[PDB]
């Protein structure tokens, strides 16, 4: 663990905990640089990379703010959220599973209708995967990914990016479980048919099930 | 325009431009604090930035990576895009209002039937509103956000979130023009109406109709 990692750490604990609490001003450099045990130097590039994470908040030449990361906070600290709280875990990951199958609802619709051939060459890849856990949360969030960008909308494409963290965590656990393998295998090849078949109509509920029912193998794993 | 903001500038203007091609190794710190005229700390400082939000992959002991934004950046891009492809902008404004009304149909009917207590406080700050496109833009960015938030699932948080700068500067331009505060007034009164009803399954249609003709004042404006 670098100087800069533990200083990174160390502030992040020490906001969720309330030393430096959300809605006041962060104490000054020599004092945190003092307490953390880090150069100046590291302190500065550290507190860069909590502002853009959206934990502080920097102005030129006013004190630093310690954000509520509610407000600030985009979908990079998902993992950081997960490893803060390990008791709402369970809550967080259905709650990101959740999303991904609600959004997914409209930009794999889209993309059927939009560009159907690059929907069905993301949807292909599933035909070479190997049979184990961290190949299929690879494919599974390329796909969703790649369906998302396929829809010609590529915001949708930025909001899967901010969710990669925990979604892969989140597969790398799931697909350790053959039957989660055959089932998403199965939504692929059920996806290209759909898309094949011009079966816009359709997306919804195929989605909709695949989350329900890929949601009751994962809640019975966790 | 501080040594920090021209670097950032430079290096994500290069990279757009190709003289620091996505796929390849960003130029040694050497080289490139002398190119920009900036000190090595403010280089490093600009980086560490640079690669939280994206741009480039940093490793401990590994050259600096360039890396293409569209698979590594998230929502916070969107007004660094916005400035980098001036001639785009009204496609990328037309894909961020039709994630907000597509999401929204989800995360508003979830709100309505969890936390329909929630929604309807949060409704209820339109009708303090001052007349104006600051105002109406800030209003109707917290309503959105405040409804996303109260269907319980603060991952749609954490999206609007991200969503917030291009956001915001588009509502800016948006509520200058009175018809368009006007419409709003009217979404979020029809809103609360159908919180206070119950009825969920009225929402899609609803929100789906607001973007649609917001729309149609938007692209007139444009």
Same mark, same amino acid.
């Given at each position: 663990?670098?100087?800069?990692?533990?200083?990174?750490?160390?502030?992040?604990?020490?906001?969720?905990?309330?030393?430096?609490?959300?809605?006041?001003?962060?104490?000054?450099?020599?004092?945190?640089?003092?307490?953390?045990?880090?150069?100046?130097?590291?302190?500065?590039?550290?507190?860069?990379?909590?502002?853009?994470?959206?934990?502080?908040?920097?102005?030129?030449?006013?004190?630093?703010?310690?954000?509520?990361?509610?407000?600030? /906070?985009?979908?990079?600290?998902?993992?950081?959220?997960? @490893? !803060?709280?390990?008791?709402?875990?369970?809550?967080?990951?259905?709650? !990101?599973? /959740?999303?991904?199958?609600?959004?997914?609802?409209?930009?794999?619709?889209?993309?059927?209708?939009?560009?159907?051939?690059?929907?069905?060459?993301?949807?292909?890849?599933?035909?070479?995967?190997?049979?184990?856990?961290?190949?299929?949360?690879?494919?599974?969030?390329?796909?969703?990914?790649?369906?998302?960008?396929?829809?010609?909308?590529?915001?949708?494409?930025?909001?899967?990016?901010?969710?990669?963290?925990?979604?892969?965590?989140?597969? @790398?656990?799931?697909?350790?479980?053959?039957?989660?393998?055959?089932?998403?295998?199965?939504?692929?090849?059920?996806?290209?048919?759909?898309?094949?078949?011009?079966?816009?109509?359709?997306?919804?509920?195929?989605?909709?099930?695949?989350?329900?029912?890929?949601?009751?193998?994962?809640?019975?794993?966790?």
């Amino acid at each position: 663990q670098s100087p800069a990692g533990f200083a990174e750490e160390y502030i992040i604990e020490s906001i969720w905990n309330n030393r430096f609490p959300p809605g006041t001003i962060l104490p000054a450099e020599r004092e945190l640089s003092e307490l953390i045990g880090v150069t100046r130097t590291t302190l500065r590039e550290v507190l860069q990379r909590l502002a853009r994470d959206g934990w502080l908040t920097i102005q030129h030449g006013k004190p630093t703010k310690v954000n509520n990361f509610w407000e600030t /906070s985009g979908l990079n600290i998902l993992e950081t959220l997960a @490893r !803060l709280d390990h008791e709402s875990v369970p809550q967080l990951i259905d709650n !990101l599973l /959740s999303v991904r199958t609600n959004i997914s609802t409209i930009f794999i619709r889209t993309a059927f209708r939009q560009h159907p051939d690059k929907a069905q060459e993301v949807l292909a890849t599933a035909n070479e995967v190997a049979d184990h856990a961290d190949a299929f949360a690879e494919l599974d969030y390329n796909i969703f990914r790649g369906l998302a960008f396929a829809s010609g909308n590529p915001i949708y494409g930025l909001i899967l990016n901010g969710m990669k963290g925990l979604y892969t965590r989140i597969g @790398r656990h799931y697909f350790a479980n053959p039957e989660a393998r055959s089932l998403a295998l199965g939504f692929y090849h059920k996806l290209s048919a759909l898309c094949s078949e011009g079966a816009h109509d359709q997306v919804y509920e195929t989605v909709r099930r695949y989350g329900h029912e890929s949601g009751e193998i994962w809640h019975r794993m966790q």
